[PDB]
């Protein structure tokens, strides 16, 4: 189709207008005193959110060049969400400040390449300064404080997340699902369990709980469909010669074998139970192998030329206890060899890296936690679905922030770490004057988040910023109390990874966006 081309200052002005529109839409949700944003959705009720990425993903403009600018800025928030999980609004604010100051410098009559190189050099120095400023976060108090700060100053969710992380440990999975009650509750699962229940209601020997419990049973693993009992006469007779129970994990068992199994259980000859193989596809065989490794047994597969008729007690695993109810099956305290456990978890961990979809990463991490460690679920509670979504988003943000803080560490919050870094980088210089101007642009625009945080509170950002610059160390400003003090003592902690990623992505996008000379787009 036909194209429209604009050169120079006109294109730059349209781009800056689009950037300003998007950034003004996003900026109102920054700090402890930020406000919510209502998002129109044609399929149902509007969704009200405070996330910067959720607001940025929805904005597009009528004008073509302003839409160009908005879409170019959106990638900062998108990448900040994908990489760290937080710092989307801070990244957007930093990108807007870089773009504004750099466009002013370009309009002053300087080439964009030198400004971009100076900005990159300043950010490279700032990353190392931030790494120098970092402090480890190990105790549960710091984790609770990070979770509280990351959830709009909600102490309950921070304490709950800290307790869940302490219970599960370091190699485990914590996930959030919407609950049904009015208050949040935490449920933790020890060992491994899969969402597969008993085949027939006649296997339950403990009707009081509606679940069957087997003490020191066997485990038989099979991938083939079962319709006749002839292949299990030897194994069943061998385990009936011993007395202690047996468990069958197969993909499916037809009613012909169910009849003999249930009649044998009722007549009091051999106590057996049957559960379907969990999952489907290659994942089903993978978790079958995981169960085999943990229970100290060997899988029986038809395709590898192994038949169930020749199976014996060496191909059957063992477990301390097994609890099977209508929906779940739990294996307690398997008797497998440890080195096999470490080998399997290492294999799955290294397989995680090559996965390209985060869904596969989640599945393999869940597999690692199931085979070794524990799994916990957080059921958030709210009266209304809208409040449900709001609380769920806040809890997910807190979880991501706590994870990042555990991974890398914490720095003083409230936007004062960037101020300290900029103050320490005051002696940076470049090859020529324009590179120095770009470095000054980056250093001056590192002060944007604190100014916006103070502005959201209805105070004067200039005097607060000047007072903060006069202090040293972790001295800062508390927006909730409107008073100064030591940021660490008051519990305002910020992960280092979030700040570093936000700064890096904002600078990377804005440096390219500054250099624009002309724009090509379709006619309206």
């Amino acid at each position: 189709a036909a194209k429209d081309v604009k050169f120079g200052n006109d294109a730059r002005v349209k781009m800056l207008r689009g950037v300003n529109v998007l950034a003004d839409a996003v900026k109102v949700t920054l700090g402890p005193k930020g406000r919510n944003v209502v998002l129109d959705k044609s399929f149902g009720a509007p969704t009200i959110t405070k996330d910067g990425v959720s607001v940025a993903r929805e904005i597009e403009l009528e004008d073509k060049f302003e839409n160009m600018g908005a879409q170019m800025v959106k990638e900062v928030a998108s990448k900040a969400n994908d990489a760290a999980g937080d710092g989307t609004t801070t990244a957007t604010v930093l990108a807007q400040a870089i773009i504004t100051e750099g466009l002013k410098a370009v309009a002053a009559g300087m080439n964009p390449m030198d400004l971009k190189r100076g900005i990159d050099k300043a950010v490279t120095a700032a990353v190392e300064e931030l790494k120098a400023l970092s402090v480890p976060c190990s105790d549960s108090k710091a984790i609770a404080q990070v979770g509280t700060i990351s959830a709009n100053s909600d102490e309950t969710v921070g304490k709950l997340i800290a307790e869940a992380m302490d219970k599960v440990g370091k190699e485990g999975v914590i996930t959030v699902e919407d609950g049904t009650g009015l208050q949040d509750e935490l449920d933790v699962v020890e060992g491994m369990q899969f969402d597969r229940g008993y085949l027939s209601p006649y296997f339950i020997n403990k009707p009081e709980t509606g679940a069957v419990e087997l003490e020191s049973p066997f485990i038989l693993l099979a991938d083939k469909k079962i319709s006749n009992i002839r292949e299990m006469l030897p194994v069943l007779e061998a385990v009936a010669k011993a007395g202690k129970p047996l468990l069958i994990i197969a993909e499916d068992v037809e009613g012909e074998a169910l009849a003999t199994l249930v009649v044998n259980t009722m007549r009091g000859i051999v106590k057996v139970a049957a559960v379907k193989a969990p999952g489907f596809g290659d994942r089903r065989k993978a978790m079958l192998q995981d169960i085999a490794t943990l229970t100290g047994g060997t899988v029986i597969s038809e395709e590898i030329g192994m038949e169930l008729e020749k199976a014996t007690l060496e191909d059957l695993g063992q477990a301390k206890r097994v609890v099977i109810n209508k929906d779940t099956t739990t294996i307690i305290d398997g008797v497998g060899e440890e080195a096999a456990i470490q080998g399997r978890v290492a294999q799955i961990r290294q397989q995680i890296e090559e996965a390209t979809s985060d869904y596969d990463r989640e599945k393999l991490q869940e597999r690692v936690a199931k085979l070794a460690g524990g799994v916990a679920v957080i059921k958030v509670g709210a009266a209304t679905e809208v409040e449900m979504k709001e609380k769920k988003a806040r809890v997910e943000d807190a979880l991501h922030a706590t994870r990042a803080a555990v991974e890398e560490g914490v720095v003083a919050g409230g936007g004062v770490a960037l101020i300290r870094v900029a103050s320490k980088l005051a002696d940076l210089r470049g090859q020529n004057e324009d590179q120095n101007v770009g470095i000054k642009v980056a250093l001056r625009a590192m002060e944007a988040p604190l100014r916006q945080i103070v502005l959201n509170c209805g105070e004067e950002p200039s005097v607060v910023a000047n007072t903060v610059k006069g202090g040293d160390g972790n001295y800062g400003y508390n927006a909730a109390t409107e008073e100064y003090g030591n940021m660490i003592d008051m519990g305002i902690l910020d992960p280092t990874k979030v700040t570093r990623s936000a700064l890096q992505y904002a600078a990377s996008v804005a440096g390219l966006m500054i250099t624009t000379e002309c724009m090509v787009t379709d006619l309206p």
């Binding site: 399929f43 969402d195 489907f280 596809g281 994942r283 390209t356 979809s357 985060d358």
Partner: protein, 379 residues
């Protein structure tokens, strides 16, 4: 550019009606080699209606065909509001026509005239191995996979009602990846929502769509509202011939809008479109073009076609005059000539009723046996 194609399963009332009409046509054609069939079907809650004009020397009772056909999809229960045996089917078909002796005389079958006025189109591209637009082809394959799994019994709680939407992006006129995959299906109430999407994506979505075309940006959507238990003829009105665009090409090719199901091969509204696809597929398989379409025009009461036009989108390796010359002297575009060389007078329209009339190798109009000859002539 971003384009979306949507396909539906065989359990939908319109697809049920289409299957009934074609099933009757095959039964009539088997009993009467030279019958005249023009039928339509209507299905609603518990009531099934059939009508049209069918002139034949043989008699067929529609009841046993309808019960056999409906049972094939799987409507053998009353849980979804439609059962094969409990339902009732009525006939509103005029089995006789006044013009059975006045026009019985014929001069020459090889010079038969077209009974309708209009222009028909064909289409074929080398984007897929089946010489068909990709988004519509993969949409048909997805619902085909669901039916095969449902019939196999590995997924017994699935229901016949299913709909899929596939989105494809094109960069410089070529496929570079898959953007969004949507599969809407009806399930039984025993299985919860969370286990539902896990089974469908890993056994239907995963082993059908190409793996190398899936990137990290692909988005999978399953059950948008969250509950698709309600379905069947109860939830929607049923009638014949409403989604011809879905059956033929999915919108990537301009179509005349002529209904296909329930029509005898004598009418050019169906057979001539088949020949155009056959010619278009043949002329593109030889490598003479990357994409090609055939525009054939016919007039009511006129034997010789008025005009034949070929358009290529500028990808032709030879001038369009040569392309037009080859199709005239190597393909018999006669309304009766294409009937004989495509031998459509066989009971083969039952399978064509569902899952697209085009895009299957076993169809007589989808053969590429003439591709080699055209390559030699144009070379």
């Amino acid at each position: 550019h971003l384009f979306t194609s949507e396909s539906v399963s065989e359990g939908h009332p319109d697809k049920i009606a289409d299957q009934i009409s074609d099933a009757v046509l095959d039964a009539i054609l088997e009993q009467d080699p030279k019958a005249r069939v023009a039928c339509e079907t209507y299905v609603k809650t518990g009531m099934v209606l059939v009508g049209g004009e069918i002139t034949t020397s043989a008699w067929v009772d529609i009841e046993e065909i309808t019960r056999n056909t409906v049972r094939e999809i799987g409507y053998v229960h009353s849980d979804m509001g439609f059962d094969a045996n409990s339902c009732a089917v009525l006939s509103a078909i005029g089995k006789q026509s006044p013009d059975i002796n006045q026009g019985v005389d014929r001069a020459d079958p090889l010079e038969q005239g077209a009974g309708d006025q209009g222009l028909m189109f064909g289409y074929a591209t080398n984007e897929t191995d089946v010489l068909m637009p990709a988004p519509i082809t993969y949409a048909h394959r997805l619902v085909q996979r669901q039916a095969e799994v449902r019939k196999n019994g590995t997924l017994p709680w699935l229901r016949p009602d299913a709909k899929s939407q596939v989105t494809f992006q094109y960069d410089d006129g070529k496929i570079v990846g898959i953007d969004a995959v949507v599969l809407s299906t009806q399930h039984s109430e025993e299985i919860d929502q969370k286990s539902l999407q896990e089974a469908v994506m890993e056994e239907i979505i995963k082993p059908i769509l190409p793996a190398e075309w899936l990137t990290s940006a692909t988005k999978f959507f399953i059950n948008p509202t969250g509950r698709f238990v309600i379905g069947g003829p109860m939830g929607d009105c049923g009638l014949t011939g409403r989604k011809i665009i879905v059956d033929t090409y999915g919108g990537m090719a301009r179509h005349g809008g002529g209904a296909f199901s329930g029509k005898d091969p004598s009418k050019v509204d169906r057979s001539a479109a088949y020949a155009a696809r056959y010619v278009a597929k043949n002329i593109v398989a030889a490598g003479l073009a990357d994409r090609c379409e055939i525009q054939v025009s016919y007039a009511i009461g006129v034997a010789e076609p008025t005009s034949i036009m070929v358009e290529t989108f500028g990808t032709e390796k030879v001038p369009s005059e040569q392309l037009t010359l080859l199709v005239r002297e190597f393909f018999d575009l006669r309304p009766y000539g294409l009937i004989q060389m495509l031998d459509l007078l066989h009971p083969i329209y039952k399978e064509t009723a569902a899952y697209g009339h085009f895009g299957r190798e076993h169809f007589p109009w989808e053969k590429t046996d003439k591709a080699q000859l055209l390559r030699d002539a144009a070379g």
